[PDB]
Amino acid sequence: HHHHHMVDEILKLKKEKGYIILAHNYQIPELQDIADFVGDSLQLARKAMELSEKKILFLGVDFMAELVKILNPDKKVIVPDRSATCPMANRLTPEIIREYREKFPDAPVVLYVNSTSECKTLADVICTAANAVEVVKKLDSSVVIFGPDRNLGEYVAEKTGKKVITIPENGHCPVHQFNAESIDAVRKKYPDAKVIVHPECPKPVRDKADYVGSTGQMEKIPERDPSRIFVIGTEIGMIHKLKKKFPDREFVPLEMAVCVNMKKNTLENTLHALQTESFEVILPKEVIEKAKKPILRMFELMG
Ligand code: SF4
Ligand SMILES: [Cl-]
Ligand SMILES: [Cl-]
């Protein structure tokens, strides 16, 4: 097959040129399979910090590769599609952050890791879907500014009991807007299945689910839940990751959900990336120094 030629050439070039391939959980299965590591954005960035290699091929979207770069400034990070981006992250702007800082100067700015690097330079702390509840609990203030996802922010408020001011207006991920009627229909079909949905899902979806977790948390649930069948309310790429990790279980998509920007990465342009060793992720040194502060603040709170 043309794919078998591509995979062979990819593995050949990545060994010859000293590249470690890091793929996000939402990449196509063919790219997850040729990666050295598959995980969420913070997992991949922290994994890179342990590598002796100085070259990384990242398969995801731009804020994730930049996150790798921020925590690994001396490594060459390349991406195969430089336009792979996150529309939810791009809806939050420096102007909106400063507008709300001025309206509420006592409320720390908590920025979901899903954010532009420029916005990260303006945050008081960064958080992931997994650690957002704990990060906000540990902050002194009972009021926080949170962005750029309103559903994760409102979930944090439910769990912490703190006041969470979300920016921008209607900040959301289109991939996770499942219908709660899909949970009703799937519990009829699989009455003993466990339903796991992302915290980015709307509240009626989260409230009808057995678990609410990020992708990193979804793949630890079968370690403590013996259920044969799990229904997954996140992007379709996680089904492949889950089935590969727990082949003795069945994983059913709540609905078919595809992030188009995640699907911009293919075998073809991944091969092109290794052939040309482009496109390198470059940030201004000042952006790296500034964005590190809210990231280090998150490590300190979590540890
Ligand atoms: S799945 Fe949603 S949050 Fe993730 S990159 Fe795509 S649009 Fe952004
Ligand atoms: Cl982990
Ligand atoms: Cl480095």
Answer yes or no: is the C-beta of 201 below 6 A from any ligand 1 atom: no
Phi, psi of 179 (to 5 degrees): -95, 135
Which atom number of ligand 1 is nearest to the Cα of residue 89? 8
- Is the separation of the CB atoms in 24 and 41 below 8 Å? yes
Write the residue with the smallest CA distance to atom 3 of ligand 1. Answer: 173
End-to-end CA distance of the chain: 48
- Asked whether 183 and 205 are in contact (CB, 8 A), the reply is yes
- The structural domains of the chain, with segments of one domain joined by +, span 1-80+264-284, 87-172, 173-256
d(CA 272, CA 57): 11
Distance (Å, whole) CA 233 – CA 242 = 12
Q: How far is the CA of 5 from the centre of ligand 1 (A)?
A: 31
Experiment type: X-ray
Comparing CA positions, the residue from 173, 115, 164, 106 lying closest to residue 135 is 164
CB 57 within 8 Å of CB 17: no
DSSP state of 43: H
Question: Residues 87, 90, 92, CA angle at the centre, nearest 5°?
Answer: 125
Resolution of this model in Å is 2.2
Residue 184's contacts (CB-CB under 8 Å, 6 or more residues apart) are 208
- With a 6 Å cutoff on the Cβ, whether 257 touches ligand 1 is no
Ligand nearest to the CA of 44: 2
Cross-strand partners of 280:
78
Residues contacting 234, CB < 8 A, separation 6+: 175, 176, 197, 198, 215, 218, 257
Q: Which ligand is closest to the CA of 63, given by its number?
A: 1
Burial of 88 (0-12, 13-18, 19+ CB in 10 A): buried
Nearest ligand 1 atom to the CA of 26 is 1
Whether residue 36 contacts residue 20, with contact meaning beta carbons closer than 8 Å, is answered with yes
DSSP string, 214-259: -HHHHTTGGGT---SEEEEES-THHHHHHHHH-TTSEEEESS----
